Amino acid sequence: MKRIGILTSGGDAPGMNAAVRAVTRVAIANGLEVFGIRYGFAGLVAGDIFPLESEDVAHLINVSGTFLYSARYPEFAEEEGQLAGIEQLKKHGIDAVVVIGGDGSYHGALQLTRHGFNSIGLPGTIDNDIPYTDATIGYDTACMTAMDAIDKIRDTASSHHRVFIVNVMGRNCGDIAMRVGVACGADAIVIPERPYDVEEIANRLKQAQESGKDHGLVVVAEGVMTADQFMAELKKYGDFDVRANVLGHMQRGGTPTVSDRVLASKLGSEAVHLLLEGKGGLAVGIENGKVTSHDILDLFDESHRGDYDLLKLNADLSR
Template sequence: MKRIGVLTSGGDAPGMNAAVRAVVRKAIYHGVEIYGVFGGYAGLISGNIRKLELGSVGDIIHRGGTFLYSARCEEFKTKEGQGKGIEQLKKHGIEGLVVIGGDGSYMGAKALTEHGFPCVGIPGTIDNDIPGTEFTIGFDTALNTVIDAIDKIRDTASSHDRTFVIEVMGRNAGDIALWAGLAGGAETILIPEDEYDMKEIASRLKKGHERGKKHSIIIVAEGVMSGYEFGKQLKEETDFDTRVTVLGHVQRGGTPTAFDRVLASRLGARAVELLMEGRGGRAVGIEKNQMVDYDIIEALAKKHTVDLNLYKLSKELSI
């Protein structure tokens, strides 16, 4: 291929800029022209497309968010919208497209692939819920943001003998809650992938209180319920002084960690290699620290699973 495009779509994630930088510089290194699509699939439909140079991605590897901007686009879910997007790609002479985002972004790449336009998907989402990869771009940074918040909240929880309920993001996946809860020493973790027993949770908290434990941290994944709803249920079972914190979009921002920067760079470079090899319709990922790629349609057919061994360990360590 002589000319490819790159776009970011859906929710932003720390490390997306590092991935775009890798795509741009890897392409230019191999003599391939690279065009940026600004504003996700909405920008693709409207033709908000500009050629990128080496300097276009200077000093962005450390920045959170995405300098290409992102947007959700209902129109692109239709065949008409997809047709408009393909027209714009052809108008600009773009022969292949790298799409960085979550499962919604992958669905758009899948649609283009089915229309015969080669795309490669890069997993960029803090939720870590994309099949075909152990880690997604942004997950590690979001995880460290949550852990930092847990550590700070534990200070005030211990000072006031309180139980804190912390609601974290993750959509329908419990990875952020599980990893942050385990790393942060949470007494209870609630994830969508497993049922919970409020009476059992209340019983464990009471037993801890009886042996002298004055405060507790409970992590609730948003896919289970809101933190406020859980806090209300907990108060009905116990008389503990309870506070609720919803971390919200602070989890999506911030300087990407070294892990996310390296992961994004590796995935971005591999995506360009696949297009240069004429292998569109793929999704790249990392497994056992090695780059892998799957048919994007097959990848979307798989179901993301959380590591239940980690979940079991978190329960064993929170006695």
């Protein structure tokens, strides 16, 4: 193995750039040549591939987004795109690929591996929705973005004795909602993985109101329903002074946190090392607070488990 490729795929996340940096620099420290692949698997098929020198990854560690760009490509799942991407890989002498993205992009890493181009999946997504990892790159930053936004909501809610219903991101995963909900002392948190009871939430808010609390907050994972939809259901059970906000795509951006930058650096390094020892078809992540890797095949049979105990904890904390 002499040359490696890097691509970012799926929805961008803060810290992707730190991962590209880490892969590039650890690879160059081990005698490898590095190539950037733009627009994910889309540019792979198009042949948007270029040499990445060590100097080319300067001033990136603190930068959000992906400087390589990301773009969706359905035909890469099919043999048409596979072969076209592979021909492009061969054209540039690339032997192996690091794929930075969500578990969706891991499919492409596996297909590449099966065609003789060993590949590693690296978790870059805000959602933390990948099996066998407790963290994905971008997740901590999204949580901070949402927390800071909801802190501001709590300021205005408190001045006015208002209840807010707030959508956070997550896709079909409730991890952002639970973590941000606890961090922002939400009265209730509503997620796809665990049952919720609108009437019970209404009762919580009523009791809090009676106890003199000057604000209310329900954090609703976007995967359940919109804030507007939840607010409408809530209003059936009581007369509340309530507003609904949807935080939106700000959760995908911003300079990556200390945790995201370090996580991206650890995982990028691990990916290169796995490749150096002749491994492929692996996804790297965090288990039991340490860096681990698994066959991508094994992830496709499993589901992400979030920290659902946070709901029980917040049940005590919300008064």
